[PDB]
Design an enzyme around this catalytic site. Sequence first.
Site, short mmCIF file in Angstrom:
data_model
loop_
_atom_site.label_atom_id
_atom_site.label_comp_id
_atom_site.label_asym_id
_atom_site.label_seq_id
_atom_site.Cartn_x
_atom_site.Cartn_y
_atom_site.Cartn_z
N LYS A 1 0.80 -1.22 0.00
CA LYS A 1 0.00 0.00 0.00
C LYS A 1 0.83 1.28 0.00
O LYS A 1 2.03 1.25 0.27
CB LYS A 1 -0.93 -0.02 1.20
CG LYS A 1 -1.80 -1.26 1.28
CD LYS A 1 -2.51 -1.26 2.61
CE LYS A 1 -3.17 -2.57 2.91
NZ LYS A 1 -3.76 -2.52 4.27
N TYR B 1 -12.26 -3.82 -2.92
CA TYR B 1 -12.87 -3.67 -1.60
C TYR B 1 -14.38 -3.86 -1.64
O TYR B 1 -15.09 -3.30 -0.80
CB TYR B 1 -12.56 -2.29 -1.02
CG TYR B 1 -11.14 -2.10 -0.53
CD1 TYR B 1 -10.62 -2.88 0.51
CD2 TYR B 1 -10.31 -1.11 -1.07
CE1 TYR B 1 -9.34 -2.69 0.99
CE2 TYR B 1 -9.02 -0.90 -0.60
CZ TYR B 1 -8.54 -1.70 0.44
OH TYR B 1 -7.28 -1.48 0.94
N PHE C 1 -16.27 3.24 6.79
CA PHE C 1 -14.91 3.50 6.33
C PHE C 1 -14.65 3.20 4.86
O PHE C 1 -13.56 3.48 4.36
CB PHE C 1 -13.94 2.70 7.20
CG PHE C 1 -14.18 1.22 7.16
CD1 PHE C 1 -13.69 0.45 6.11
CD2 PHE C 1 -14.94 0.60 8.14
CE1 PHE C 1 -13.95 -0.92 6.03
CE2 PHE C 1 -15.21 -0.77 8.08
CZ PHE C 1 -14.72 -1.53 7.02
N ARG D 1 0.39 -14.59 4.56
CA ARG D 1 -0.41 -14.12 5.70
C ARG D 1 0.41 -14.20 6.98
O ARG D 1 0.39 -13.28 7.80
CB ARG D 1 -1.67 -14.96 5.86
CG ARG D 1 -2.62 -14.88 4.69
CD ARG D 1 -3.97 -14.40 5.14
NE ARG D 1 -4.20 -13.00 4.78
CZ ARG D 1 -5.18 -12.25 5.29
NH1 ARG D 1 -6.01 -12.76 6.20
NH2 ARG D 1 -5.34 -11.00 4.87
N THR E 1 -4.11 -8.03 11.43
CA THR E 1 -4.52 -6.68 11.03
C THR E 1 -4.06 -5.55 11.94
O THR E 1 -3.59 -4.51 11.46
CB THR E 1 -6.05 -6.61 10.88
OG1 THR E 1 -6.49 -7.66 10.01
CG2 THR E 1 -6.47 -5.28 10.30
N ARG F 1 3.94 -6.27 9.79
CA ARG F 1 3.19 -5.29 10.55
C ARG F 1 3.72 -5.15 11.97
O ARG F 1 3.77 -4.05 12.53
CB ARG F 1 1.72 -5.67 10.57
CG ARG F 1 1.08 -5.51 9.21
CD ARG F 1 -0.25 -6.22 9.12
NE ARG F 1 -0.91 -5.97 7.85
CZ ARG F 1 -1.96 -6.66 7.42
NH1 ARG F 1 -2.47 -7.64 8.16
NH2 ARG F 1 -2.51 -6.36 6.25
N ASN G 1 -1.34 -0.25 7.79
CA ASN G 1 -0.64 -1.49 8.06
C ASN G 1 0.18 -2.05 6.89
O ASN G 1 0.36 -3.26 6.78
CB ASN G 1 -1.58 -2.54 8.65
CG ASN G 1 -2.72 -2.90 7.73
OD1 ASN G 1 -2.83 -2.39 6.61
ND2 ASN G 1 -3.58 -3.79 8.19
N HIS H 1 -0.94 -6.05 2.00
CA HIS H 1 -2.14 -6.86 1.87
C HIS H 1 -1.81 -8.18 1.21
O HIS H 1 -1.01 -8.25 0.27
CB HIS H 1 -3.20 -6.15 1.03
CG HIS H 1 -4.28 -7.07 0.53
ND1 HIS H 1 -5.26 -7.57 1.36
CD2 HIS H 1 -4.48 -7.64 -0.68
CE1 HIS H 1 -6.02 -8.42 0.67
NE2 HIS H 1 -5.56 -8.48 -0.56
N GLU I 1 -8.74 -11.81 -6.65
CA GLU I 1 -7.83 -10.68 -6.67
C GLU I 1 -6.77 -10.76 -7.77
O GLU I 1 -6.42 -9.74 -8.36
CB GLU I 1 -7.17 -10.51 -5.30
CG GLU I 1 -8.20 -10.24 -4.21
CD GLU I 1 -7.60 -10.18 -2.82
OE1 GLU I 1 -6.44 -10.61 -2.64
OE2 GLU I 1 -8.31 -9.73 -1.90
#
Lengths: 135, 135, 135, 135, 135, 135
Positions: free
Chosen positions: C9, C49, C57, C85, C91, C103, C113, C116, C127
Amino acid sequence: TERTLVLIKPDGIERQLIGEIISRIERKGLTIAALQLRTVSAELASQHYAEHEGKPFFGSLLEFITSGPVVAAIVEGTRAIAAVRQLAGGTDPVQAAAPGTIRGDFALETQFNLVHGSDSAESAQREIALWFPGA
Amino acid sequence: TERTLVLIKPDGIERQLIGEIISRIERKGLTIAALQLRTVSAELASQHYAEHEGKPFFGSLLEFITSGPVVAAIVEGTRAIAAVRQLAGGTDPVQAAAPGTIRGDFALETQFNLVHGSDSAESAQREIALWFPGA
Amino acid sequence: TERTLVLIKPDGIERQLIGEIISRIERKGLTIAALQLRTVSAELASQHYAEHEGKPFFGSLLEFITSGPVVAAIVEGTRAIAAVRQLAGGTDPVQAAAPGTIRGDFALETQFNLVHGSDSAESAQREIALWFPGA
Amino acid sequence: TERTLVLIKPDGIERQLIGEIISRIERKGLTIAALQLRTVSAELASQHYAEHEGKPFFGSLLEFITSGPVVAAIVEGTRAIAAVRQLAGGTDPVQAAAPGTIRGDFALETQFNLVHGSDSAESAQREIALWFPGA
Amino acid sequence: TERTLVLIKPDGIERQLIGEIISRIERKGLTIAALQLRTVSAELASQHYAEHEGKPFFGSLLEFITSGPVVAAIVEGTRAIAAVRQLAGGTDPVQAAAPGTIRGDFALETQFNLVHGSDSAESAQREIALWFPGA
Amino acid sequence: TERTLVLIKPDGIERQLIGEIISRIERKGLTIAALQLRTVSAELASQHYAEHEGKPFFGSLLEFITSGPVVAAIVEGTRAIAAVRQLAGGTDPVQAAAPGTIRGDFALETQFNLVHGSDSAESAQREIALWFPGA
C-alpha cells in the site's frame, strides 16, 4: 584509547538512522562513553563551526544545525578518531564516500551527510570540551 | 533531479536478491518511480545492447538477457545516475567492485554481475525510452 | 503450488519498505511471478474492496488506496497464501501482529498497516484476476 | 500520542546492543524524544524499583542497575506504551518472549533481560518524572 | 549450563543459511562448543531417526538426511535446549513456527525445515553421544 | 574452481562473529567445502606461521592462535582465493581495510583482525594440506 566526538545531525534523526549509526560504531569495537539527544544554541553552533565564519555558507550552516535536535556522543577506544572517520566516509556521499560507509549507504548530498566525526586529535579535544564541558 | 534505468538481470532474480537490491536503492534516499517484472524481447534485447551488434558475444548476450525474466525500474532523485553506479560497483565483481556494493557483496563473475545502471545522462534517456516509452 | 496477491500500500511505499517486504517474501522461499508499481483507479479500488461497499470506512478505504501508487505482485509457491499471511501478521499491528512479522516490526495503526495478502484461495483467484487480467 | 520510558540496562550496553534496540524502536515508527547515557544513583534506583522495597532480592537489584551505566530514553508516538512492550517481549526471554522481540532474539535469563518499558500510562508518568525531572 | 545438539540439514546448506542460523544462536547468547560439516552414513541416520523406524516416511527420512552434507554442532549455555527450540520454531514452518524463528522466516514445508535441535535433556545426551563420540 | 583456507581466529569467535563471517562468504556465492571448530597445537601453529619464524612478534603470534579455539574452513568456488581476500579486507582494519569488508566493519587493531585467507594459490595448497590432511 583516544576519544572523538560524534554528532548525528538533524537529517540523520529525521531519517531514523540513530540506531543504525550507533550500531556501526558498536560493532566496530568502539564504546559509547557519552550519549545525549539535545538542541543546539546559536552560541554552541557558532563555536563548533568557528573555522567557517567568513565563508558564504556559514549562514545556512548554523541554521541547519539549529533546525532540529541532534545526538551528541563521545566515542572511545583504540584509534577511535580515525575509525569513526573510516566508518563515516568522505564528505561527498556520492563521489568521496565508499559504499559500506554511513554516507555511502545512506546519503546523496554533502549538505545532508548525516553525521560528524572529529577530524583530528587536536580537533577532538576542542569539540569534546565544547559539547561535553568537564569530561 | 535526474532519472536512471535500473535492471535486475536474470541472475539477480534467480538468486533472490530483488528486495535486497531495491532496499539499497531506497535506503540511499532514491525513489522508485517505475517498477516492473517482465520478459525481454529478442527485439528489445538487441536494441538495448545495440552497441555490441558487431562484437562476437552479441548472440550469447541476447540469449542471457532473454533466458529469464528481469526487473526494470526507473530510479529518480538527486544524483541518481551516479548514485546507482556507486551502489552497484564496478563491472568485475572481484577486481573492480568494492565490498559494500551490490556486485562486491554478491557476485563472482562479470558475466553474472546481477544488475545494470545507466552509465550516463545520455544513455539514461535512451534506455528509459526503450523500457518505459512515454514516461 | 498456489498463488496469492500481494499489495504494498501507499504507506508502505512512502516509508521506503518495498525492498524489505519483498526480501522477506524471497527469503521465505516464495517466488515473485509478477511485480508492478502502478496507480489505482476508483473502479479497481471499488472492486477490490467490494465486500465493504456498505460500511462507514469504505469511503476512506477507497480514498487511501488511491492517494498514491502501490506495488502489486503475484507471489507463487507452496502454501503461498498462508505463508504470505504468516509473514504479514494480523490486522492490528500492535495487538494482533507478532513481532517478526511485517506489521509487527514496522506498523503502529490498523489504517496504515503497509501490506495486503489474499486471505483465502477463493479470494486469491478473485484478486489475481482483478489486478493481473490474463495472468 | 503517548510517551513511555525505555531503559537499556547495563547488560544491554555491555553486549553492544544500544543501536540495535533503538533501531527497532525507530523502524516501528516511534520517535526518540529524549536520549541519555548516564549512571544510576542508588538513590534513584531505590525510587525506580521502589515496588520491591521489602522483597529479598531488592539489594542485588540496586547493585545490578547501579553496577554500570544505562541508557534512558523517552519514546513518543501512537500506542507507544503498548508498542514498546510488544517490541521488548515478555519478562522471561525463553518462556515468555517470542522470537522476533528484543528479549526473544538476544536474552537467556530474566535477570539479564536487557531493556525496560513502562507497563502503563501511570507507570510511565512516574518513571519519566523520575528519570527526566521537569519534562 | 546445558548442552544440545543442532543439525543444519542438507536443505539448510543448499540454501546458504549456515551463517544465518549460527548467527542467531550466537546473538542469543549461546556458545558453539563443537562445529563440523560432515556426511551422514546410513548407519548414523538410522540411529538418529530410530524413533520412526516402523513408519512409512522413515525411508524418505534416511534418504534425505544422507543426500548431502550437514553441519553438526554442540550448543552450550543457560537453558540451551529450550533456547535452541525457541529459536528454531515449531515443526510446521507455516502453521506452527512463528515469524522471527528460523523455520518461520525461511521455510515452507515440514520436510525441508532446515534445522534440528534436541527436544529434551534425555534426547540431548543421546544425540550428542551419537554425533560427537567422546565429548 | 579454486579452493582457499579460511580461519576464524580466537578473537573472531570470542566476539561471536562466526555466523556473520560465514554468511558473507555464502552470499558472495562461494561454498563451504569443509568446516570445523578445533584447537590448535604449538606444532600446527608453528607450521602455519612458518614464514615469521625469526620475527619479533612470532612468539606472541603463536600464543594467540593457541589461546583459544578457531574455526577452519575450506572455501571453494570461482576466484575463491581472491574473493575471500576481497571480503576480508587489508591487514590493518583501520588504514587498509575498506568499510564493507570483515575487518573494516568489525576490527580495530591488526593483532586482532578476526580472520585469515590464503594469499595465493601456492599458499592455499600448503595451508589446506596442513589443516585438512588428505583432502
